[PDB]
Every structure is written in C-alpha cells, then in structure tokens.
Amino acid sequence: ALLTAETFRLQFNNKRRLRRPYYPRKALLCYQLTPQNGSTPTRGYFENKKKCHAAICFINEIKSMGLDETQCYQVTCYLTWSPCSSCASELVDFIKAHDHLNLRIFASRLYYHASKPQQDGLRLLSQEGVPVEVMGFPEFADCWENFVDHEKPASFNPYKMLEELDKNSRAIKRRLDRIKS
Ligand SMILES: [Zn+2]
C-alpha cells in the first residue's frame, strides 16, 4: 500500500498552517524497518484512528511482526506531527524493550502551539536516545521516494514541493533547538 502524491503533499506540508486543525488530530506515520543483515526492508504507514494513534499502531505492528531477535534492525519513522505525551511515553517503553532495534524519529511539524506535556514527552524521548528530529530535504526526499506511488504522474512539480518543505524546515529546526537541553 502506497500513498498518492497529493496525500503526501497535504500531510507532510510543513508550511505553518494558519487555520487551526479540527478534531481529530490527523497524523500520518511512515516507517521503514531495515534488517541489518541485508534482507528485504519492510515499509508501511499508519494514520490516526479512534482505535490507536499512529505511533501506537506502529508499535503494535512491530510487536505483531515477531522479529527474529538474533538480528539487528534500523527503524526510521517519518511523522507529520511530533508525538503527544502518551505516544511519547509508549515509544520510550518500546525503545527500552527492544535493544536489538535502533529507532530514529523524524517529524515534519512539531505542534501548532507549545505545551508542557508534549515538550516534556519530546524531552523524555531525547533523553532515552531517540530525539525527535525535524525533517529536512533528505528525509522528505527519502519519504517521497519510498512511500509515494510513482507509476502515475503527479499533478504538481515534485522538486518545487521538496524545495518548499526544505525551506520551511529551517525555522522549525530553530524552534526545536531552542527547547532541547
Ligand atoms: Zn498520540
């Protein structure tokens, strides 16, 4: 299952939105499990469901895969919104449980307004060794390359989109760095 170009552009657009998002907080998560021995990487994505938030559905997917724990793995997660406090705590517990699994978290946007629970969740994830980094051009390009359907042409120019995303990420990186300590 692959995303469309328009869905990718709408979800990962990091140009600071003006009109507040309405409930529920729609959040996309694309993940890539890469086996370190070289076998086929597994890719997927999850949205916010009333059943589970994207991070929780991702954690449950990794748990249900039943990984060969004699191997080592690299996991990369591209999120549209950075995780909330509860998802951050669940991710910290998931990181601690799996010492054969090196996790990297990237986020397109952090949040519309700053909050103590979300900032403390991000600080907890940072102290555990998996800080929520901001997506730049390499991360947007990798997520575009591997998760979008390219059999059919896009309705827009992808290079201008990647340029706009990279341009907007520069200030969001400063917003993230002002907090991290
Ligand atoms: Zn959440």
Author numbering: 2 to 182
Q: What text does the study give?
A:
A3H is the most polymorphic member of the APOBEC family, as its mRNA can undergo alternative splicing to generate four splicing variants (SVs), and has seven distinct human A3H haplotypes (hap I-VII) containing various combinations of five single nucleotide polymorphisms. Literature suggests that the anti-HIV activity of A3H can be through both deaminase dependent and independent manners, and the different anti-HIV activities of the A3H variants were attributed to a combination of different factors, such as differences in RNA binding and virion packaging, protein stability, deaminase activity, and subcellular localization. Evidence so far suggests that binding to RNA is largely responsible for the multimerization of A3H and some other APOBEC members.
While A3H m1 carries a set of 7 mutations and produced a stable dimer form, stable monomeric forms can be isolated from both A3H m1+H114A and m1+W115A/C116S mutants. With these stable dimeric and monomeric forms of the A3H WT and mutants in hand, we performed crystallization trials either with the MBP tag or the cleaved forms, with or without nucleic acids, and obtained a high-quality crystal form of the cleaved A3H m1+W115A/C116S monomer that diffracted to 2.49 Å resolution. The A3H m1+W115A/C116S monomeric structure was determined to 2.49Å resolution and refined to excellent statistics. Notably, helix 6 (h6) of A3H extended six amino acid residues (1.7 turns) at its N-terminal side, making it the longest h6 among all APOBECs. The canonical short beta strand 5 (β5) of APOBEC proteins is not a typical strand in this A3H monomeric structure. In addition to β5 strand, the A3H monomer contains a long loop 1 around the Zn-center.
